[PDB]
Amino acid sequence: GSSGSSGRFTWSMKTTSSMDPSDMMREIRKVLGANNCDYEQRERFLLFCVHGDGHAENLVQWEMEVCKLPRLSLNGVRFKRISGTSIAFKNIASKIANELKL
């Protein structure tokens, strides 16, 4: 059939914001705090997202850093899956990447 078992760490998305990155960090926290989520100021432009949609043992934690794209000339929000399986991760991820009113 076909060879699978392929999956390595790498940021991938299609979210593009024309607005300055300084305004993003703001809205971001707004969306998170709204989705009964928990954010933590890690880096200068990074925040630790923590949501317990499912069970406590199956908590989801992803990072949200605002950096400039290499190929594109805009600010894109990269999401790094910290804990939880892919399913769970992509679960809430589909809420932010979208909800993000940018």
CSV table of C-alpha atoms in Angstrom, one decimal:
chain,number,residue,atom,x,y,z
A,1,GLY,CA,0.0,0.0,0.0
A,2,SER,CA,2.0,3.0,1.3
A,3,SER,CA,4.7,3.7,3.9
A,4,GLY,CA,3.6,5.9,6.8
A,5,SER,CA,4.9,6.3,10.3
A,6,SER,CA,6.0,9.9,9.4
A,7,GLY,CA,5.8,12.7,12.0
A,8,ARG,CA,8.5,15.1,13.2
A,9,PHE,CA,8.4,18.3,15.2
A,10,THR,CA,7.7,21.3,12.9
A,11,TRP,CA,5.5,24.4,13.0
A,12,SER,CA,2.8,24.4,10.3
A,13,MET,CA,-0.2,26.6,9.8
A,14,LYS,CA,-2.0,29.0,7.4
A,15,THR,CA,-2.8,31.8,9.8
A,16,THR,CA,-1.7,35.2,8.6
A,17,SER,CA,-2.2,38.5,10.4
A,18,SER,CA,-1.6,41.8,8.7
A,19,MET,CA,-1.8,43.7,12.0
A,20,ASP,CA,1.4,44.4,14.0
A,21,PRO,CA,2.6,41.6,16.2
A,22,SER,CA,2.5,43.9,19.2
A,23,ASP,CA,-1.3,43.9,18.9
A,24,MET,CA,-1.5,40.1,18.6
A,25,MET,CA,-0.1,39.2,22.0
A,26,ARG,CA,-2.9,41.3,23.4
A,27,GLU,CA,-5.8,39.8,21.5
A,28,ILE,CA,-4.3,36.3,21.9
A,29,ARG,CA,-4.6,36.5,25.7
A,30,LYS,CA,-8.2,37.8,25.2
A,31,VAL,CA,-9.2,34.7,23.2
A,32,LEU,CA,-7.6,32.3,25.6
A,33,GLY,CA,-9.0,33.9,28.7
A,34,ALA,CA,-12.4,33.6,27.0
A,35,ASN,CA,-12.1,29.9,26.2
A,36,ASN,CA,-11.6,29.1,29.9
A,37,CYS,CA,-7.9,28.6,29.2
A,38,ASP,CA,-4.8,29.4,31.1
A,39,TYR,CA,-1.9,31.5,29.7
A,40,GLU,CA,1.5,32.1,31.2
A,41,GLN,CA,4.1,34.7,30.3
A,42,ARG,CA,7.1,32.6,29.3
A,43,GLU,CA,9.1,34.7,26.8
A,44,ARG,CA,8.9,38.3,25.6
A,45,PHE,CA,6.5,37.2,22.8
A,46,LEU,CA,5.5,33.8,24.0
A,47,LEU,CA,2.7,32.4,26.2
A,48,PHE,CA,2.1,28.9,27.7
A,49,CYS,CA,-1.5,27.9,26.7
A,50,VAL,CA,-3.2,25.4,29.1
A,51,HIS,CA,-6.6,23.9,28.5
A,52,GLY,CA,-8.4,21.0,30.2
A,53,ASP,CA,-11.1,20.3,27.7
A,54,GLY,CA,-11.1,16.6,28.3
A,55,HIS,CA,-10.0,14.8,31.5
A,56,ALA,CA,-7.3,16.2,33.9
A,57,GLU,CA,-5.0,13.3,33.0
A,58,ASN,CA,-5.6,14.2,29.3
A,59,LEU,CA,-4.8,18.0,29.6
A,60,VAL,CA,-3.7,19.9,26.6
A,61,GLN,CA,-0.7,22.3,26.6
A,62,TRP,CA,0.5,24.3,23.6
A,63,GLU,CA,2.8,27.3,23.1
A,64,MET,CA,1.8,30.4,21.2
A,65,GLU,CA,4.7,32.5,19.9
A,66,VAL,CA,4.4,35.4,17.5
A,67,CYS,CA,7.2,35.5,15.0
A,68,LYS,CA,7.8,36.5,11.4
A,69,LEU,CA,7.5,34.0,8.5
A,70,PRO,CA,10.5,33.2,6.4
A,71,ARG,CA,8.7,32.8,3.1
A,72,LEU,CA,5.9,35.2,3.8
A,73,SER,CA,6.3,38.8,5.0
A,74,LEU,CA,3.8,38.7,7.9
A,75,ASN,CA,3.5,37.7,11.6
A,76,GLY,CA,2.3,34.1,12.1
A,77,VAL,CA,1.3,32.4,15.3
A,78,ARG,CA,3.2,29.2,15.7
A,79,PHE,CA,1.7,26.4,17.9
A,80,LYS,CA,4.0,23.9,19.6
A,81,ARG,CA,2.3,20.8,21.2
A,82,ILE,CA,3.7,20.4,24.7
A,83,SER,CA,1.7,17.5,26.1
A,84,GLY,CA,-1.3,15.4,25.2
A,85,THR,CA,-1.7,13.3,22.0
A,86,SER,CA,-2.2,14.8,18.5
A,87,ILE,CA,-6.0,14.4,18.6
A,88,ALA,CA,-6.5,16.4,21.8
A,89,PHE,CA,-3.9,19.0,20.7
A,90,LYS,CA,-5.4,19.6,17.3
A,91,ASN,CA,-8.8,19.7,19.1
A,92,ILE,CA,-8.3,22.9,20.9
A,93,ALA,CA,-5.8,24.1,18.3
A,94,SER,CA,-8.7,24.3,15.8
A,95,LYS,CA,-10.4,26.6,18.3
A,96,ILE,CA,-7.6,29.2,18.5
A,97,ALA,CA,-6.2,29.1,15.0
A,98,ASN,CA,-9.8,30.0,14.1
A,99,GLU,CA,-11.2,32.0,17.0
A,100,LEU,CA,-8.1,34.2,16.6
A,101,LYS,CA,-9.9,37.3,15.3
A,102,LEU,CA,-7.0,38.6,13.3
